[PDB]
Scaffold this active site. Sequence first.
Site, PDB file in Angstrom:
ATOM      1  N   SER A 160       0.818  -1.187   0.000  1.00  0.00           N
ATOM      2  CA  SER A 160       0.000   0.000   0.000  1.00  0.00           C
ATOM      3  C   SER A 160       0.867   1.258   0.000  1.00  0.00           C
ATOM      4  O   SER A 160       0.685   2.068  -0.908  1.00  0.00           O
ATOM      5  CB  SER A 160      -0.829   0.092   1.281  1.00  0.00           C
ATOM      6  OG  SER A 160      -1.713  -1.018   1.287  1.00  0.00           O
ATOM      7  N   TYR A 186      -1.561 -10.722   4.135  1.00  0.00           N
ATOM      8  CA  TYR A 186      -1.540  -9.269   4.373  1.00  0.00           C
ATOM      9  C   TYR A 186      -2.958  -8.829   4.691  1.00  0.00           C
ATOM     10  O   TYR A 186      -3.857  -8.861   3.855  1.00  0.00           O
ATOM     11  CB  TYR A 186      -0.917  -8.514   3.220  1.00  0.00           C
ATOM     12  CG  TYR A 186      -0.925  -7.015   3.214  1.00  0.00           C
ATOM     13  CD1 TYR A 186      -1.320  -6.292   4.319  1.00  0.00           C
ATOM     14  CD2 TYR A 186      -0.541  -6.272   2.103  1.00  0.00           C
ATOM     15  CE1 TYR A 186      -1.314  -4.926   4.330  1.00  0.00           C
ATOM     16  CE2 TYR A 186      -0.514  -4.896   2.071  1.00  0.00           C
ATOM     17  CZ  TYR A 186      -0.917  -4.227   3.202  1.00  0.00           C
ATOM     18  OH  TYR A 186      -0.952  -2.853   3.301  1.00  0.00           O
ATOM     19  N   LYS A 228       0.955 -10.139   8.191  1.00  0.00           N
ATOM     20  CA  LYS A 228       1.241  -8.734   8.353  1.00  0.00           C
ATOM     21  C   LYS A 228      -0.043  -8.174   9.010  1.00  0.00           C
ATOM     22  O   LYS A 228      -1.043  -8.098   8.274  1.00  0.00           O
ATOM     23  CB  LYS A 228       1.402  -8.009   7.041  1.00  0.00           C
ATOM     24  CG  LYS A 228       1.598  -6.507   7.305  1.00  0.00           C
ATOM     25  CD  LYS A 228       2.434  -5.917   6.176  1.00  0.00           C
ATOM     26  CE  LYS A 228       2.555  -4.407   6.447  1.00  0.00           C
ATOM     27  NZ  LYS A 228       1.274  -3.765   6.018  1.00  0.00           N
TER      28      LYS A 228
END
Lengths: 293, 293, 293, 293
Positions: free
Chosen positions: C47, C136, C164
């Site tokens: 991101s 993620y 994550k």
Amino acid sequence: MRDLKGIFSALLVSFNEDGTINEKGLRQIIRHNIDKMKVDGLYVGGSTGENFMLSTEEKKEIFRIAKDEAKDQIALIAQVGSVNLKEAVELGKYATELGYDCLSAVTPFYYKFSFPEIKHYYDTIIAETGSNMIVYSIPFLTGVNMGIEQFGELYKNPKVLGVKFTAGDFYLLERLKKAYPNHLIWAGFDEMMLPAASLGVDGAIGSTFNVNGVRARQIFELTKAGKLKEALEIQHVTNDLIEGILANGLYLTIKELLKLEGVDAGYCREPMTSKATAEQVAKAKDLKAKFLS
Amino acid sequence: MRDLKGIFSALLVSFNEDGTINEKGLRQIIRHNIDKMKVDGLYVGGSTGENFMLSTEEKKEIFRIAKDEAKDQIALIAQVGSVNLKEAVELGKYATELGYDCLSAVTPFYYKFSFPEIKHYYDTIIAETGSNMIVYSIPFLTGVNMGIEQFGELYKNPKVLGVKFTAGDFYLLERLKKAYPNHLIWAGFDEMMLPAASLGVDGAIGSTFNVNGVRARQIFELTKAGKLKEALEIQHVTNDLIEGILANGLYLTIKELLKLEGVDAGYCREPMTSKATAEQVAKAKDLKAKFLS
Amino acid sequence: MRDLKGIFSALLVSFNEDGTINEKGLRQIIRHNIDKMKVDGLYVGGSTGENFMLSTEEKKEIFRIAKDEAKDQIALIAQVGSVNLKEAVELGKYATELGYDCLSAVTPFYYKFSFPEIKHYYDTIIAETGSNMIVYSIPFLTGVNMGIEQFGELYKNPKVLGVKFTAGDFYLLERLKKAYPNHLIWAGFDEMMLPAASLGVDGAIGSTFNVNGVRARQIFELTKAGKLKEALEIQHVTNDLIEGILANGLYLTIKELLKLEGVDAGYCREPMTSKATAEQVAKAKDLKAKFLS
Amino acid sequence: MRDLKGIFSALLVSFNEDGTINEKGLRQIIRHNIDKMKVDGLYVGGSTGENFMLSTEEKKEIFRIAKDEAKDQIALIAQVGSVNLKEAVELGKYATELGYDCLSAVTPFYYKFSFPEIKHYYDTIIAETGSNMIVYSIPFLTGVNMGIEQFGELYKNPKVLGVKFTAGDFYLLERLKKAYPNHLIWAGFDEMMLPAASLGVDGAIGSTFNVNGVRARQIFELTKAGKLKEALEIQHVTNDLIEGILANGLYLTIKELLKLEGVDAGYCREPMTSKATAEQVAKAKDLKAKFLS
């Protein structure tokens, strides 16, 4: 039995500066709704009446005054829900003793109650009071959202007559009518009357009907008649008044608008700001002059 | 004056089958907290107490029984908040007259009150009682999320000692401590005790401390001494029981676990399901053997 | 398999004014992370790299450039997630061919995928590339919340190494370390490193480490050692910095801070606002003066 | 410039087992919409086309195929929005080069873009292509909600024709029509067609119109003529069909419904479940029997 369809104002309450009920002023709000707004009924003790900020004795006082003043001129629905089920029972009996046409009760809130808990709560009010019940949904304040299956389980009690739908899910609304065509539905968002009336709602319970009853009835009846272009216009003008009322503060603005009609609508009850500022008063005066004169 | 730091149980209440308070059972729960759990104090009338389902008279009785049973053995915090500000003042004054060490109040809920209405609510309760105030934040039940600037405004009143942070925003928690290093913070999520302690909270108010009080003090006291490894294992074991309690149903399971101690913790108050099923009782007993024997 | 624990900067990418990749500036951001920030690795294509605003070719270019400049000096994780599974397989294969140590993938977003769809997505990237995978999780951007049971399903694939954890649930966090003690967890919220480290996370992947990597490391290292007071003070200064970064514009401020180190961090990619205003540049210089000089 | 009011089927795309476009089946979905559903147009490249799961070239091929099959028989609107503005401009030009009558574009998603960023994104697509634009609102997937003042800013560009209102807020839809009476509105929720048409939307863009286009046109036309009772009856039957569709998997059920008309609608594209289960296949059959026979 009394007809519960049609236009119902959610009754607002007049309070004195110290937070006590101004009975005279409350009587003037009821007389204005009946004589001027020409409502079919009143929905007393609901969120608009500042109900959840009062004690059990004051709620009873409000129920007594409203029934004493309205008498049998209109229908009367009594909202007696609470997080306290015994309080709900005791209020429900009192309004039943006074002659209210039906009870209504908000989903119990604050705690995250299971659905069976919510149904047991409706069943207990009904069972203990002997009165008919209107389920009161208002998801934006309670955080409780009911689905079609859940309305079906509540509707297994035959004294549950329908729902006060203060929700903007038009898909759910349509499904309710499809699955329970004999159960009533009162729209609870005044700014969405037209769309709600095109889906067959049986009436509306609204806080802005205290000042905009004429237009509200007009939207309702014109929609039911297929006169959609005319209904939209009146909803447009209604929605401009509504938009000013929401921006300026809902409870205080409706109270100031009533004052401009000569109704002693008084103050709001604390922890809600009890008095309007100069700016709120000037803005109400402009709303009156643009839409209600 | 009395120190308010440390471990406070959020006091559960014993009810009889008809909803009335079980004074003997309640007394036993207090005695269990003081004598076996070794809490530094009790937080009476909070959500765990089933408080918002009761009348003002029942909340007064609970306050009379806890003060009379605990005496001056421990610190006592009286949660007196409500949607009814008059009721908050009345309870507030009663708890102050009973000699509670401090008051606490939930942000007024149901209605969407503005921040200054919220602040005016806190200032009014203090002004009518003269007692210290603990802001009670519980976003998951109220829908109210206050930020650093709002806490500062509340903290202009010197009677405001801090907040019962029943929230899981650990960025905000850190910022409150950095911004108001002299204000107190009690962690409200028992299952998140170590992470909260690692950021410097001054104590914790919890419902699971009614039965897991020995373990809660150890996580706290080991985390404060930097013995994070040992702390985490005890929080690991604690979270196993908490996951168990939550899955079996919080209020009933903690009450059933209290019964397993010799404490008449009774029923839950309706609209909450008042009786534990046989499955719930069996699971309570498995949690007993596994985690608290 | 290279050690993936520790401190990883979520790599920012430098863009020219026309939106193309500035290769030179990108190299300078990488050199700054390896040489000055002293990170254990880079998390490329996340991101923070402005990845979802770019074509498949530009993503490949960034993976080329990051691997060419870092070589085998630090660990490299390649975020290859997308709403497009063929694209994620294609990127996963290219990053595996270049030598990235591990792959990572955001849960497919936009559409509301079922949990089996999410699991099939991860298993497909793994089977097609042969690489290990880091799940993620980023609920604030994706709207996807996974629980312990779902993580367990994901962990049936032995090439999934862990998650994550870019989410603020510290209960779920604890549960995950407890249920899956050999799976890794990298904290994703820089401003909550300390409490995450107290729960035993194995490292952290963060955007602020591109400029604040010295302190980031110290908090994690002081927290894992039990030196909580020191850690907490460094978290308090980090959070002052981060609050200013967040208020000034997360992406532009970090690149403005990088430019005050002599790194040509360039512009943001459109639709994101591409140029810092004079006020943003001035605030960057204040942040740099006070926290990074 | 060609008329854009009326009934628009959000085109579904036929994928092969391996996820590549099945051009023959895509052509049959188009001929069914134009020849049997009798739509006024097609909305190509929307969410319903499984658009955000594909590559740019695949987006271009579907644009090429649908124009080539539809020719000038009906209006065509090209959805070209993306998180990649560069791709959004490239698709926009391509669709403009093919002769689409207007573009449309979802608010950029995934990152939390600012309003001015959202506006700059539509003004760039408009400027680089020279085509008119329909702002595509789908809050439940994007999480982006825009208010009256934001539509007003977007509406400052004269090439913005209006909005694909895929939202359930009927107050906002009334306010939009009141504030910008000359801007078009297309209802995005098929199951709320009637109430949307009662507030004056100018047409509807819907995925269920691929198989229920005859009723969808009746509800529209009947409601516009104020024939509420027939409209409602037909919305009711429509909503039983949509209820079944939603319950069985929207994407696979419309394709399976298509295949029962001899249209080769194929598989869904992965990460969505590509193949319908035997149960999904039997329930589509029941839906066809009850509502489309």
